Design a protein around this ligand. Structure first.
Ligand SMILES: NCC(=O)NCCOCCOCCNC(=O)c1ccc(S(N)(=O)=O)cc1
Ligand SMILES: [Hg+2]
Ligand SMILES: [Zn+2]
Length: 256
């Protein structure tokens, strides 16, 4: 099955998921000189004071921190969006080296990692239904650059040892996502898709201008994770990112 290896990597995904070559894929390069300043763009509204984290899980392609989304607990609104989007999970994409790892690029510049905070439009009732609509999801993308440690990320880093292989999970309550946000909420937005199979084109991307910094040691722990399950040949979970895809006439709007 699909992965990031040379035999099952992104270049092969189109075979089982033809949408891989659709008209609104994701990730893309943000050409900052071609991005359009849209004055009609509203400021983002991140309401995560009430977020209820549940657990963390190694799903074989990344680690996900899941939240309780049975109620309007942690939501995203404003920006290019209409209605409320509820946080379901967050995960990262990282590289084998500091010079690569992000999915989206800014003027072809790659970051060490990229944080994705996944939300689904509540008008559709459930996540499964949101994935069948063109305005079904909203993913908040935050770039990670190597520098100073991120206080707020440390809690995640420490549990990683507990979910080393695919299929492992650990309780992960009382995690506050606000600790992962940059100071500024300026963003780029464009119509896109999931970045992993099934690559559904249901996402409104909100990519923050300002990156968060993490330490070398924080990033290193990410790379200690395994793609494989327990008792199988060890394969380091690195470079779980997809290359930039053709914009194809879509327009990237800037809130700044
Ligand atoms: N009805 C059968 C069926 O499979 N329906 C599935 C409904 O939607 C399924 C989508 O796959 C779910 C798993 N993936 C994700 O949730 C998921 C979420 C976000 C991103 S990303 N990287 O673009 O932020 C990538 C993947
Ligand atoms: Hg869709
Ligand atoms: Zn992602």
């Amino acid at each position: 099955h699909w992965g990031y290896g040379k035999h099952n990597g992104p270049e092969h995904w189109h075979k089982d998921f033809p949408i891989a070559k659709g008209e609104r894929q994701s990730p893309v390069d943000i050409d900052t000189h071609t991005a359009k300043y849209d004055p009609s763009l509203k400021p983002l509204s991140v309401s995560y004071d009430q977020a209820t984290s549940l657990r963390i899980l190694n799903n074989g392609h990344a680690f996900n921190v899941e939240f309780d989304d049975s109620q309007d607990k942690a939501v995203l609104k404003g920006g290019p969006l209409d209605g409320t989007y509820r946080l379901i999970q967050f995960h990262f994409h990282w590289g084998s080296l500091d010079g690569q790892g992000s999915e989206h690029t800014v003027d072809k510049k790659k970051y060490a990692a990229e944080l994705h905070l996944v939300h689904w439009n509540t008008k559709y009732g459930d996540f499964g239904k949101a994935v069948q609509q063109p305005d079904g999801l909203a993913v908040l993308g935050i770039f990670l650059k190597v520098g100073s440690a991120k206080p707020g990320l440390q809690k995640v880093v420490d549990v990683l040892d507990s979910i080393k292989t695919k299929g492992k999970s650990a309780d992960f309550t009382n995690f506050d996502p606000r600790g992962l946000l940059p100071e500024s909420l300026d963003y780029w937005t464009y119509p896109g898709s999931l970045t992993t199979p099934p690559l559904l084109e249901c996402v409104t991307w909100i990519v923050l201008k300002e990156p968060i910094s993490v330490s070398s040691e924080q990033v290193l722990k990410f790379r200690k994770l395994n793609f494989n399950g327990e008792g199988e040949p060890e394969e380091l979970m690195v470079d779980n990112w997809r290359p930039a895809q053709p914009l194809k006439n879509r327009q990237i709007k800037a809130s700044f």
